[PDB]
Write a protein that binds this DNA or RNA. Sequence first.
DNA 1: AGCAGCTGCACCT
DNA 2: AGGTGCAGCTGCT
RNA 3: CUAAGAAAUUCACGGCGGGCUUGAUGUCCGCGUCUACCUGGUUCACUGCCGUGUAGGCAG
Lengths: 333, 333, 305
Amino acid sequence: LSTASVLAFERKLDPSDALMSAGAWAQRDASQEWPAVTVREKSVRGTISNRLKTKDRDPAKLDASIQSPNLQTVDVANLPSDADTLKVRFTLRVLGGAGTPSACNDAAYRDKLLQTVATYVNEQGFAELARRYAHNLANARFLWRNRVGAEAVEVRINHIRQGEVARTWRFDALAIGLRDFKADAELDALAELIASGLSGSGHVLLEVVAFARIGDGQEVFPSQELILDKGDKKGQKSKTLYSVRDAAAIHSQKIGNALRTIDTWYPDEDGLGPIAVEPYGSVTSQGKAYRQPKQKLDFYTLLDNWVLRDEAPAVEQQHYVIANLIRGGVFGE
Amino acid sequence: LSTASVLAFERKLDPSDALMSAGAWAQRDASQEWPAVTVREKSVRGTISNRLKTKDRDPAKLDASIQSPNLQTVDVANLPSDADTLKVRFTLRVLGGAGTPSACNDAAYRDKLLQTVATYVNEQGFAELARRYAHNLANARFLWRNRVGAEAVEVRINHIRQGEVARTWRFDALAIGLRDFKADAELDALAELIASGLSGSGHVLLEVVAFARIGDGQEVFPSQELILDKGDKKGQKSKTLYSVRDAAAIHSQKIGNALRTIDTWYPDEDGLGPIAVEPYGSVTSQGKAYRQPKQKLDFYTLLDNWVLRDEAPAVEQQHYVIANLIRGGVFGE
Amino acid sequence: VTDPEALLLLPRLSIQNANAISSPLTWGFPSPGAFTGFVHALQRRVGISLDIELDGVGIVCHRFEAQISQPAGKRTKVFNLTRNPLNRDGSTAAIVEEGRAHLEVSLLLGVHGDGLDDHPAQEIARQVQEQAGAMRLAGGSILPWCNERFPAPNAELLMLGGSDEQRRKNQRRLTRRLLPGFALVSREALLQQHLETLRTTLPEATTLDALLDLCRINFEPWQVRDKPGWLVPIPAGYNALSPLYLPGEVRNARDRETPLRFVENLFGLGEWLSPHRVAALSDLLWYHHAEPDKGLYRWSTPRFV
DNA sequence: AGCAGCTGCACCT
DNA sequence: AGGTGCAGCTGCT
RNA sequence: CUAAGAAAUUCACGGCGGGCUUGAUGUCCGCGUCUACCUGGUUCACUGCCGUGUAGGCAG
């Protein structure tokens, strides 16, 4: 028995693009007609602040570079001067049926994998994973830089059963930290709903709205696009922000990456905090791979030891493997 | 007698390119001015997630590969943020005269083929194949990934005889599963209609519209294009969705492949579900060919045993070869 | 060669997945031989049973939509393909490139037989429409009726009937239904004229049909040498590479009851024009004729200017 | 008493 | 996201 | 009798870090817009009465 040649997993926990709108705090219950945060342009005169090559550290060349500065156009998004609260809204569907791949070659490999995940579900439910997902919804981690230095963050989560709301959760997202996973009754009820969605025993659709009290006219941070070339035929536009229908918006993969920031079992440390679940669980902001393949704690070696050779790892690493299965991806040769 | 050197069956069950649109649930009766779902672009930045070679498990090399960003441009298609229902509409014409090939070099072989399929219609009608095609139109199998995890799917089929609607069918596509084949009076009436269209007793025209209740602003999945790479050149857009006049669409052959998923008589198993009918019946998702030529259950040897050798196979294998006749093809040496 | 007694108008034919390449040199609109074969199969299917003959096609191409893409670092274009099913060993398939397209075209068909004699015009038009709503045109399916409820019925128009001024008024009111699209004609005379005035430098013929339909940028005596119309390459027809062959003597024929030959494509120049620029609406009818003593098997549109 | 197929291998730029 | 052939091969008789 | 006849692309993803664009300015001289017309084309389908009536008529 060997691993399959092609083997692919569709994602559970599908979010949408989060849209931004603006309003005043304590009108946030009437925040259905709040106007969108629009993306504008402004001019930026760039100074000289890079490290020099020290073949270019001659003072005459430096002053000649300072005398002629370069200029860009830059997309920017601010709150209005009369509104102090950013509202960010998206929808998230929890699907279930996490072990089944969407593509496979070997029948014996997918049957061994299916009974492996069946034994995992029978040992413990999705309660740890859904507890951590509900925590990452409770604290507003999906506000990436908009949460930083906010005065008050409040998350409203609506389980939507038919076209109307079935249940409502209200969270103070600054009390629920970004560091540890506590216990709370409403948080455990949300975790039970997410675990019921992940187990295939229901169809879970939630609407997540987050209100951050930042200040009047302050800068908000939508998702940022990719610029390949830049010339004078444009405005020397050097920064593009993502937008859905003239609304500053966040990419769906950004919200998804902030949802699955649950991995506290990586071997290097635990005082740093959780990271996102990746094969060779890596942080682009730190340029580093936790769970290196030289240690036996990346996703691929753990999966191959669990399925092929029946070496079941510790329950923390089993949580990590099933989290990587819910995350989805292309796993094969 | 021998096989003709050319053999060419024109396809029946011609579908159209299914166009997508969006709106709210319980407005689906007035869903004629529903706006089209459009294809946007966005940027993705990923990490290293695939399997590394055993020579490339070096941790310094892994960190040095991580510290170079991985950026793609991706075509995406979403629902609007105030619509939760995807509407997929296509037209399907049934022609009839399922026996006659478009080309046959041997005259006596085509006469033996014509009386063979004539005797097949005389033995029983198309009602097995017609009931299975009406099942695949009843459950929304043509919603390929859009059906997965949907809240409520609902199919409306309008038979149009003249310029106006002759008859209407209304189905809850989630009650009708994808595994078994039931019997229902409306479903059997549609089966009679498509059987009479297949028998050459008319030219049936159908308009099929499927409403899936996914969620507000969620992602839909149209067809993807085939772009062969410009290898020694710049990087390309790494996903391209199909669109007909700025409306996200599913390919015609994708709907056709979803329609003829009727074959529950392949020898390997019977609980894995129906597959699409083709000679050496092979699914691309499993990557493995059922109905191998080393067993005598593929299309070519069954056709040669029924026509040339006059060994009539079992009634489900006659159903299989009749479905391969309706499917069409270019057969010969 | 034969002036039609009447014209039938296939009003707005939408076609999905039609063949785009249609030639080893062109890739755009399909060849006119496809439309001539369409009306010959239509005459075989419903034309014979009505004491009607059909002779030619006029084509106007209301809209075009090719399934192509430009590969992001080049100025050329590639075709979008389909995923064929797997081989019998389940490995993969062999990629053969085909070019699909979407078309909106109208057809002008000439009639000589007992048109208004045996049957009225409305029933003839309706059953020819019903016959053409069950076949395929150029490798791609005729897309059936959708929420276009207006453009359904045809107009069987008698050519020489009525007064000559009334003839011009009814052909103008039929041209009023052919406004958005641009009709297609053959331009062999313009090809030979430019071939003769180019032969003052060098005697080559394919280099003419190269130089006729590109953007020639001539230096300052920066200008662009321009033709007054929309000159395109077309597959002009077939010229035989072989003598005649009996129905049995070649293996793997389409039928053992019809003679066979090996052929090559002759290429010529066509032209897209506005339909108001032609005064006689029977000038646009593409006839295909055989000269079987040699290989010259032609589609053109004679009696046009 | 062979036959036909069949799989597999190799070529090659 | 190759066509080809042919050497060898299996074989059971 | 149509370079005919046949076809599933597809699974997954964090683009963000930061910035002073500034100084200075005379828009201005001159000019013939005229001649001639039916708003009615039934153009206000109204107001009130007898009659249980919306059925039917009346009076100005």
